[PDB]
Write a protein that binds this ligand. Structure first.
Ligand SMILES: Nc1ncnc2c1ncn2[C@@H]1O[C@H](COP(=O)(O)OP(=O)(O)O)[C@@H](O)[C@H]1O
Length: 234
């Protein structure tokens, strides 16, 4: 249900992700034209910036499935098991093509037996892509420093899109979500909180709200005021 409309900002990202969108909607068109798409896009940027959200939106913008997983979980699994699932991930994916496959914390694999077996499996799976393969693999990373070099070779994640901290609207949206469940006072202006927290990321905001919630309860107050919010921040 997420489209590029539900994504605040990310001008270039969406621009660069159009070719992908178009392709997923009518892959047969691109097949007939003899055109080849990258099919391996890595979103690079800090945590709580909207990478999973943008990816999901890319699958929605093309009204196609969005199959996810986490390079982190794969590594958490017993050796052999992780690679077994990487296998299951792409198998299921081909079953439901076109669509998007989203591997999160891909540096879990890129950056130990488990980690190696999962990496090789992923690589073989991605190298097994034929032209007629209508799957676009999107991965996410915030630690590009540790990402394994092989993942970035042409044919794999040979395309990257940097993603920065959310804009004023994107900040307001996160605050609004996380504000859900909290007794805000009348003076609370979430739009304003959004305006005066430039640079903040998902965590900075999710936390600020919580800390603002503690000063409230810790002082016995039954409602978080704009003050608490402003204080919680510093
Ligand atoms: N532009 C935006 N519009 C709406 N929500 C956003 C936006 N940017 C971030 N968010 C919120 O912040 C959370 C951050 O997680 P995610 O989008 O997966 O990115 P990341 O991989 O950087 O953590 C999302 O679940 C979403 O609810």
């Amino acid at each position: 249900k997420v489209t590029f409309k539900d994504v605040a900002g990310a001008e270039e990202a969406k621009e660069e992700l159009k070719e992908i969108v178009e392709f997923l909607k009518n892959p047969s068109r691109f097949h007939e034209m003899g055109a080849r798409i990258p099919k391996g896009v890595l979103l690079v940027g800090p945590p709580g910036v909207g990478k999973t959200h943008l990816a999901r939106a890319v699958a929605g913008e093309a009204r196609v499935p969005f199959i996810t997983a986490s390079g982190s979980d794969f590594v958490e699994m017993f050796v052999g098991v992780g690679a077994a699932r990487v296998r299951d991930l792409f198998e299921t994916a081909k079953r439901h093509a076109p669509c998007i496959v989203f591997i999160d914390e891909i540096d879990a694999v890129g950056r130990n037996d488990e980690r190696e077996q999962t990496l090789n499996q992923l690589l073989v799976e991605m190298d097994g892509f034929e032209k007629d393969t209508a799957i676009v693999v999107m991965a996410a990373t915030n630690r590009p420093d540790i990402l394994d070099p092989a993942l970035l070779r042409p044919g794999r994640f040979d395309r990257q899109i940097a993603i920065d901290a959310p804009d004023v609207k994107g900040r307001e949206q996160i605050l609004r979500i996380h504000a859900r469940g909290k007794p805000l006072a009348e003076d609370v202006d979430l739009a304003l909180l959004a305006k005066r927290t430039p640079g903040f990321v998902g965590a900075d905001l999710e936390n600020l709200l919580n800390e603002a919630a503690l000063l409230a309860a810790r002082e016995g107050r039954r409602k978080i005021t704009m003050k608490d919010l402003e204080e919680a921040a510093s």
